[PDB]
């Protein structure tokens, strides 16, 4: 157990999957989905309410 | 006093200015002031490199 690499591969897989999903979720926050900009503060400072 | 022709449209770089957009925009002489991606009243609350 000490020497072999990836002996705990299953727990590592669980953690990696969860962290990867979160990383994707935060990354998607950067995409603008076609809007003018991906920052709400930018849109609100730039554009009128309507 | 004299703008360039349409085909040969001149350009000028503006830098280090303080832009009093609100006092310009509210003037009555402009027949149209359409803006895109930005709103005219907000323009003072902004700053463009």
mmCIF file of N, CA and C in Angstrom:
data_model
loop_
_atom_site.group_PDB
_atom_site.id
_atom_site.type_symbol
_atom_site.label_atom_id
_atom_site.label_comp_id
_atom_site.label_asym_id
_atom_site.label_seq_id
_atom_site.Cartn_x
_atom_site.Cartn_y
_atom_site.Cartn_z
ATOM 1 N N UNK A 1 0.826 -1.196 0.000
ATOM 2 C CA UNK A 1 0.000 0.000 0.000
ATOM 3 C C UNK A 1 0.864 1.251 0.000
ATOM 4 N N UNK A 2 1.945 1.248 0.784
ATOM 5 C CA UNK A 2 2.828 2.408 0.819
ATOM 6 C C UNK A 2 3.428 2.686 -0.553
ATOM 7 N N UNK A 3 3.955 1.649 -1.205
ATOM 8 C CA UNK A 3 4.746 1.869 -2.413
ATOM 9 C C UNK A 3 3.865 2.071 -3.638
ATOM 10 N N UNK A 4 2.900 1.182 -3.855
ATOM 11 C CA UNK A 4 2.134 1.168 -5.095
ATOM 12 C C UNK A 4 1.449 2.512 -5.301
ATOM 13 N N UNK A 5 1.532 3.033 -6.522
ATOM 14 C CA UNK A 5 0.821 4.252 -6.868
ATOM 15 C C UNK A 5 -0.596 3.921 -7.321
ATOM 16 N N UNK A 6 -1.510 4.855 -7.077
ATOM 17 C CA UNK A 6 -2.924 4.701 -7.403
ATOM 18 C C UNK A 6 -3.571 3.540 -6.662
ATOM 19 N N UNK A 7 -3.029 3.155 -5.505
ATOM 20 C CA UNK A 7 -3.644 2.086 -4.726
ATOM 21 C C UNK A 7 -5.046 2.475 -4.279
ATOM 22 N N UNK A 8 -5.256 3.760 -3.990
ATOM 23 C CA UNK A 8 -6.549 4.281 -3.567
ATOM 24 C C UNK A 8 -7.313 4.923 -4.714
ATOM 25 N N UNK A 9 -7.238 4.340 -5.909
ATOM 26 C CA UNK A 9 -7.744 5.019 -7.086
ATOM 27 C C UNK A 9 -9.209 5.391 -6.999
ATOM 28 N N UNK A 10 -9.997 4.637 -6.235
ATOM 29 C CA UNK A 10 -11.438 4.871 -6.228
ATOM 30 C C UNK A 10 -11.800 6.134 -5.451
ATOM 31 N N UNK A 11 -11.208 6.320 -4.272
ATOM 32 C CA UNK A 11 -11.444 7.548 -3.523
ATOM 33 C C UNK A 11 -10.916 8.756 -4.285
ATOM 34 N N UNK A 12 -9.746 8.610 -4.907
ATOM 35 C CA UNK A 12 -9.227 9.673 -5.752
ATOM 36 C C UNK A 12 -10.192 9.991 -6.878
ATOM 37 N N UNK A 13 -10.794 8.967 -7.481
ATOM 38 C CA UNK A 13 -11.744 9.211 -8.559
ATOM 39 C C UNK A 13 -12.945 9.993 -8.057
ATOM 40 N N UNK A 14 -13.465 9.629 -6.888
ATOM 41 C CA UNK A 14 -14.605 10.359 -6.337
ATOM 42 C C UNK A 14 -14.244 11.827 -6.148
ATOM 43 N N UNK A 15 -13.116 12.084 -5.486
ATOM 44 C CA UNK A 15 -12.727 13.462 -5.203
ATOM 45 C C UNK A 15 -12.489 14.222 -6.499
ATOM 46 N N UNK A 16 -11.819 13.590 -7.461
ATOM 47 C CA UNK A 16 -11.525 14.251 -8.723
ATOM 48 C C UNK A 16 -12.804 14.601 -9.461
ATOM 49 N N UNK A 17 -13.762 13.678 -9.500
ATOM 50 C CA UNK A 17 -15.014 13.967 -10.186
ATOM 51 C C UNK A 17 -15.717 15.153 -9.548
ATOM 52 N N UNK A 18 -15.797 15.171 -8.218
ATOM 53 C CA UNK A 18 -16.485 16.275 -7.557
ATOM 54 C C UNK A 18 -15.777 17.601 -7.816
ATOM 55 N N UNK A 19 -14.453 17.622 -7.656
ATOM 56 C CA UNK A 19 -13.712 18.859 -7.861
ATOM 57 C C UNK A 19 -13.820 19.327 -9.302
ATOM 58 N N UNK A 20 -13.782 18.396 -10.251
ATOM 59 C CA UNK A 20 -13.906 18.760 -11.654
ATOM 60 C C UNK A 20 -15.273 19.355 -11.945
ATOM 61 N N UNK A 21 -16.328 18.773 -11.375
ATOM 62 C CA UNK A 21 -17.656 19.338 -11.575
ATOM 63 C C UNK A 21 -17.734 20.755 -11.025
ATOM 64 N N UNK A 22 -17.203 20.982 -9.822
ATOM 65 C CA UNK A 22 -17.219 22.338 -9.278
ATOM 66 C C UNK A 22 -16.411 23.290 -10.144
ATOM 67 N N UNK A 23 -15.241 22.852 -10.603
ATOM 68 C CA UNK A 23 -14.405 23.713 -11.427
ATOM 69 C C UNK A 23 -15.130 24.103 -12.703
ATOM 70 N N UNK A 24 -15.828 23.153 -13.321
ATOM 71 C CA UNK A 24 -16.644 23.484 -14.482
ATOM 72 C C UNK A 24 -17.726 24.485 -14.111
ATOM 73 N N UNK A 25 -18.370 24.286 -12.962
ATOM 74 C CA UNK A 25 -19.456 25.177 -12.580
ATOM 75 C C UNK A 25 -18.964 26.610 -12.437
ATOM 76 N N UNK A 26 -17.821 26.804 -11.783
ATOM 77 C CA UNK A 26 -17.293 28.155 -11.635
ATOM 78 C C UNK A 26 -16.828 28.696 -12.979
ATOM 79 N N UNK A 27 -16.225 27.845 -13.807
ATOM 80 C CA UNK A 27 -15.770 28.300 -15.113
ATOM 81 C C UNK A 27 -16.931 28.808 -15.951
ATOM 82 N N UNK A 28 -18.061 28.100 -15.924
ATOM 83 C CA UNK A 28 -19.219 28.539 -16.690
ATOM 84 C C UNK A 28 -19.640 29.943 -16.296
ATOM 85 N N UNK A 29 -19.308 30.362 -15.078
ATOM 86 C CA UNK A 29 -19.663 31.702 -14.637
ATOM 87 C C UNK A 29 -18.975 32.763 -15.481
ATOM 88 N N UNK A 30 -17.897 32.398 -16.175
ATOM 89 C CA UNK A 30 -17.174 33.375 -16.981
ATOM 90 C C UNK A 30 -17.803 33.562 -18.353
ATOM 91 N N UNK A 31 -18.532 32.568 -18.847
ATOM 92 C CA UNK A 31 -19.128 32.651 -20.170
ATOM 93 C C UNK A 31 -20.321 33.595 -20.166
ATOM 94 N N UNK A 32 -20.474 34.334 -21.262
ATOM 95 C CA UNK A 32 -21.505 35.357 -21.369
ATOM 96 C C UNK A 32 -22.778 34.874 -22.052
ATOM 97 N N UNK A 33 -22.802 33.646 -22.569
ATOM 98 C CA UNK A 33 -24.014 33.073 -23.155
ATOM 99 C C UNK A 33 -24.675 34.027 -24.143
ATOM 100 N N UNK A 34 -23.876 34.826 -24.842
ATOM 101 C CA UNK A 34 -24.392 35.754 -25.822
ATOM 102 C C UNK A 34 -24.693 37.140 -25.299
ATOM 103 N N UNK A 35 -24.672 37.342 -23.988
ATOM 104 C CA UNK A 35 -24.930 38.664 -23.449
ATOM 105 C C UNK A 35 -23.813 39.624 -23.842
ATOM 106 N N UNK A 36 -24.010 40.898 -23.506
ATOM 107 C CA UNK A 36 -23.011 41.910 -23.833
ATOM 108 C C UNK A 36 -21.704 41.612 -23.116
ATOM 109 N N UNK A 37 -21.782 41.278 -21.832
ATOM 110 C CA UNK A 37 -20.595 40.957 -21.054
ATOM 111 C C UNK A 37 -20.979 39.948 -19.985
ATOM 112 N N UNK A 38 -19.972 39.265 -19.458
ATOM 113 C CA UNK A 38 -20.185 38.202 -18.488
ATOM 114 C C UNK A 38 -20.130 38.686 -17.046
ATOM 115 N N UNK A 39 -20.054 39.993 -16.818
ATOM 116 C CA UNK A 39 -20.026 40.565 -15.477
ATOM 117 C C UNK A 39 -21.280 41.409 -15.309
ATOM 118 N N UNK A 40 -22.097 41.072 -14.310
ATOM 119 C CA UNK A 40 -23.330 41.818 -14.098
ATOM 120 C C UNK A 40 -23.044 43.262 -13.719
ATOM 121 N N UNK A 41 -22.010 43.494 -12.913
ATOM 122 C CA UNK A 41 -21.649 44.866 -12.584
ATOM 123 C C UNK A 41 -21.328 45.660 -13.838
ATOM 124 N N UNK A 42 -20.621 45.049 -14.787
ATOM 125 C CA UNK A 42 -20.321 45.729 -16.042
ATOM 126 C C UNK A 42 -21.599 46.101 -16.780
ATOM 127 N N UNK A 43 -22.538 45.162 -16.890
ATOM 128 C CA UNK A 43 -23.777 45.438 -17.612
ATOM 129 C C UNK A 43 -24.549 46.555 -16.926
ATOM 130 N N UNK A 44 -24.626 46.503 -15.597
ATOM 131 C CA UNK A 44 -25.407 47.492 -14.866
ATOM 132 C C UNK A 44 -24.768 48.871 -14.921
ATOM 133 N N UNK A 45 -23.439 48.943 -14.927
ATOM 134 C CA UNK A 45 -22.779 50.233 -15.067
ATOM 135 C C UNK A 45 -22.868 50.739 -16.499
ATOM 136 N N UNK A 46 -23.014 49.828 -17.460
ATOM 137 C CA UNK A 46 -22.937 50.216 -18.862
ATOM 138 C C UNK A 46 -24.303 50.567 -19.430
ATOM 139 N N UNK A 47 -25.342 49.832 -19.047
ATOM 140 C CA UNK A 47 -26.625 49.900 -19.728
ATOM 141 C C UNK A 47 -27.721 50.400 -18.798
ATOM 142 N N UNK A 48 -28.744 50.989 -19.407
ATOM 143 C CA UNK A 48 -29.907 51.452 -18.673
ATOM 144 C C UNK A 48 -30.763 50.263 -18.240
ATOM 145 N N UNK A 49 -31.668 50.462 -17.286
ATOM 146 C CA UNK A 49 -32.427 49.336 -16.734
ATOM 147 C C UNK A 49 -33.156 48.550 -17.811
ATOM 148 N N UNK A 50 -34.006 49.192 -18.620
ATOM 149 C CA UNK A 50 -34.832 48.393 -19.542
ATOM 150 C C UNK A 50 -34.020 47.597 -20.543
ATOM 151 N N UNK B 1 -15.844 72.517 -38.114
ATOM 152 C CA UNK B 1 -16.161 73.350 -39.272
ATOM 153 C C UNK B 1 -16.287 72.617 -40.607
ATOM 154 N N UNK B 2 -15.594 71.495 -40.799
ATOM 155 C CA UNK B 2 -15.733 70.758 -42.057
ATOM 156 C C UNK B 2 -15.340 69.304 -41.832
ATOM 157 N N UNK B 3 -16.311 68.401 -41.910
ATOM 158 C CA UNK B 3 -16.004 66.994 -41.737
ATOM 159 C C UNK B 3 -15.484 66.393 -43.041
ATOM 160 N N UNK B 4 -14.740 65.300 -42.900
ATOM 161 C CA UNK B 4 -14.210 64.565 -44.038
ATOM 162 C C UNK B 4 -15.331 63.889 -44.821
ATOM 163 N N UNK B 5 -15.060 63.611 -46.093
ATOM 164 C CA UNK B 5 -16.062 62.946 -46.908
ATOM 165 C C UNK B 5 -16.379 61.579 -46.306
ATOM 166 N N UNK B 6 -17.463 60.980 -46.792
ATOM 167 C CA UNK B 6 -17.907 59.701 -46.252
ATOM 168 C C UNK B 6 -16.898 58.599 -46.552
ATOM 169 N N UNK B 7 -16.467 58.491 -47.811
ATOM 170 C CA UNK B 7 -15.556 57.411 -48.180
ATOM 171 C C UNK B 7 -14.232 57.533 -47.445
ATOM 172 N N UNK B 8 -13.684 58.740 -47.357
ATOM 173 C CA UNK B 8 -12.450 58.962 -46.612
ATOM 174 C C UNK B 8 -12.855 59.555 -45.271
ATOM 175 N N UNK B 9 -13.146 58.681 -44.315
ATOM 176 C CA UNK B 9 -13.583 59.103 -42.991
ATOM 177 C C UNK B 9 -12.346 59.242 -42.119
ATOM 178 N N UNK B 10 -12.135 60.435 -41.581
ATOM 179 C CA UNK B 10 -10.999 60.684 -40.714
ATOM 180 C C UNK B 10 -11.219 60.083 -39.329
ATOM 181 N N UNK B 11 -10.112 59.897 -38.617
ATOM 182 C CA UNK B 11 -10.127 59.376 -37.259
ATOM 183 C C UNK B 11 -9.200 60.214 -36.399
ATOM 184 N N UNK B 12 -9.488 60.209 -35.104
ATOM 185 C CA UNK B 12 -8.687 60.923 -34.125
ATOM 186 C C UNK B 12 -8.705 60.160 -32.813
ATOM 187 N N UNK B 13 -7.529 59.962 -32.231
ATOM 188 C CA UNK B 13 -7.403 59.232 -30.979
ATOM 189 C C UNK B 13 -7.587 60.191 -29.810
ATOM 190 N N UNK B 14 -8.403 59.786 -28.842
ATOM 191 C CA UNK B 14 -8.694 60.585 -27.657
ATOM 192 C C UNK B 14 -8.075 59.876 -26.460
ATOM 193 N N UNK B 15 -7.281 60.606 -25.678
ATOM 194 C CA UNK B 15 -6.575 60.000 -24.557
ATOM 195 C C UNK B 15 -6.430 60.995 -23.414
ATOM 196 N N UNK B 16 -6.318 60.455 -22.201
ATOM 197 C CA UNK B 16 -6.149 61.214 -20.965
ATOM 198 C C UNK B 16 -7.280 62.201 -20.702
ATOM 199 N N UNK B 17 -8.371 62.123 -21.454
ATOM 200 C CA UNK B 17 -9.483 63.036 -21.258
ATOM 201 C C UNK B 17 -10.298 62.729 -20.008
ATOM 202 N N UNK B 18 -11.057 63.741 -19.600
ATOM 203 C CA UNK B 18 -12.186 63.599 -18.694
ATOM 204 C C UNK B 18 -13.379 63.886 -19.597
ATOM 205 N N UNK B 19 -14.239 62.895 -19.808
ATOM 206 C CA UNK B 19 -15.321 63.027 -20.780
ATOM 207 C C UNK B 19 -16.664 63.335 -20.127
ATOM 208 N N UNK B 20 -17.113 64.578 -20.303
ATOM 209 C CA UNK B 20 -18.363 65.088 -19.742
ATOM 210 C C UNK B 20 -19.544 64.671 -20.625
ATOM 211 N N UNK B 21 -19.679 63.361 -20.829
ATOM 212 C CA UNK B 21 -20.729 62.864 -21.715
ATOM 213 C C UNK B 21 -22.118 63.382 -21.362
ATOM 214 N N UNK B 22 -22.473 63.448 -20.079
ATOM 215 C CA UNK B 22 -23.831 63.878 -19.741
ATOM 216 C C UNK B 22 -24.149 65.291 -20.230
ATOM 217 N N UNK B 23 -23.195 66.222 -20.155
ATOM 218 C CA UNK B 23 -23.507 67.577 -20.610
ATOM 219 C C UNK B 23 -23.605 67.639 -22.131
ATOM 220 N N UNK B 24 -22.854 66.791 -22.831
ATOM 221 C CA UNK B 24 -22.962 66.684 -24.284
ATOM 222 C C UNK B 24 -24.284 66.050 -24.709
ATOM 223 N N UNK B 25 -24.623 64.915 -24.103
ATOM 224 C CA UNK B 25 -25.812 64.153 -24.471
ATOM 225 C C UNK B 25 -27.094 64.953 -24.284
ATOM 226 N N UNK B 26 -27.228 65.648 -23.162
ATOM 227 C CA UNK B 26 -28.466 66.382 -22.937
ATOM 228 C C UNK B 26 -28.622 67.603 -23.835
ATOM 229 N N UNK B 27 -27.650 67.922 -24.686
ATOM 230 C CA UNK B 27 -27.823 69.051 -25.587
ATOM 231 C C UNK B 27 -28.927 68.755 -26.600
ATOM 232 N N UNK B 28 -29.607 69.817 -27.034
ATOM 233 C CA UNK B 28 -30.753 69.699 -27.929
ATOM 234 C C UNK B 28 -30.385 69.563 -29.404
ATOM 235 N N UNK B 29 -29.161 69.924 -29.794
ATOM 236 C CA UNK B 29 -28.804 69.911 -31.211
ATOM 237 C C UNK B 29 -28.729 68.508 -31.808
ATOM 238 N N UNK B 30 -28.379 67.499 -31.023
ATOM 239 C CA UNK B 30 -28.265 66.151 -31.572
ATOM 240 C C UNK B 30 -29.637 65.577 -31.902
ATOM 241 N N UNK B 31 -29.862 65.313 -33.192
ATOM 242 C CA UNK B 31 -31.129 64.752 -33.645
ATOM 243 C C UNK B 31 -31.278 63.293 -33.236
ATOM 244 N N UNK B 32 -30.166 62.591 -33.042
ATOM 245 C CA UNK B 32 -30.197 61.209 -32.591
ATOM 246 C C UNK B 32 -28.938 60.935 -31.788
ATOM 247 N N UNK B 33 -29.066 60.046 -30.808
ATOM 248 C CA UNK B 33 -27.971 59.712 -29.909
ATOM 249 C C UNK B 33 -27.977 58.223 -29.609
ATOM 250 N N UNK B 34 -28.352 57.411 -30.593
ATOM 251 C CA UNK B 34 -28.424 55.977 -30.369
ATOM 252 C C UNK B 34 -27.094 55.445 -29.857
ATOM 253 N N UNK B 35 -27.180 54.502 -28.923
ATOM 254 C CA UNK B 35 -26.022 53.849 -28.337
ATOM 255 C C UNK B 35 -26.295 52.356 -28.279
ATOM 256 N N UNK B 36 -25.230 51.564 -28.337
ATOM 257 C CA UNK B 36 -25.348 50.114 -28.348
ATOM 258 C C UNK B 36 -24.380 49.532 -27.333
ATOM 259 N N UNK B 37 -24.869 48.573 -26.546
ATOM 260 C CA UNK B 37 -24.072 47.976 -25.498
ATOM 261 C C UNK B 37 -23.782 48.899 -24.335
ATOM 262 N N UNK B 38 -24.219 50.159 -24.410
ATOM 263 C CA UNK B 38 -24.004 51.155 -23.368
ATOM 264 C C UNK B 38 -25.186 52.114 -23.398
ATOM 265 N N UNK B 39 -25.441 52.770 -22.260
ATOM 266 C CA UNK B 39 -26.519 53.747 -22.195
ATOM 267 C C UNK B 39 -25.954 55.149 -21.971
ATOM 268 N N UNK B 40 -26.599 56.175 -22.537
ATOM 269 C CA UNK B 40 -26.000 57.519 -22.490
ATOM 270 C C UNK B 40 -25.912 58.135 -21.104
ATOM 271 N N UNK B 41 -26.900 57.909 -20.236
ATOM 272 C CA UNK B 41 -26.835 58.483 -18.894
ATOM 273 C C UNK B 41 -25.727 57.853 -18.059
ATOM 274 N N UNK B 42 -25.483 56.559 -18.257
ATOM 275 C CA UNK B 42 -24.417 55.841 -17.568
ATOM 276 C C UNK B 42 -23.023 56.304 -17.987
ATOM 277 N N UNK B 43 -22.886 56.862 -19.193
ATOM 278 C CA UNK B 43 -21.566 57.142 -19.757
ATOM 279 C C UNK B 43 -20.611 57.831 -18.787
ATOM 280 N N UNK B 44 -21.099 58.746 -17.950
ATOM 281 C CA UNK B 44 -20.184 59.325 -16.969
ATOM 282 C C UNK B 44 -19.755 58.313 -15.914
ATOM 283 N N UNK B 45 -20.633 57.381 -15.537
ATOM 284 C CA UNK B 45 -20.229 56.335 -14.604
ATOM 285 C C UNK B 45 -19.308 55.292 -15.226
ATOM 286 N N UNK B 46 -18.704 55.631 -16.367
ATOM 287 C CA UNK B 46 -17.792 54.672 -17.044
ATOM 288 C C UNK B 46 -16.415 55.290 -17.286
ATOM 289 N N UNK B 47 -15.531 54.550 -17.956
ATOM 290 C CA UNK B 47 -14.148 55.006 -18.237
ATOM 291 C C UNK B 47 -13.536 54.024 -19.232
ATOM 292 N N UNK B 48 -13.230 54.462 -20.454
ATOM 293 C CA UNK B 48 -12.767 53.524 -21.507
ATOM 294 C C UNK B 48 -11.282 53.709 -21.807
ATOM 295 N N UNK B 49 -10.414 52.689 -21.628
ATOM 296 C CA UNK B 49 -8.995 52.941 -21.843
ATOM 297 C C UNK B 49 -8.783 54.129 -22.772
#
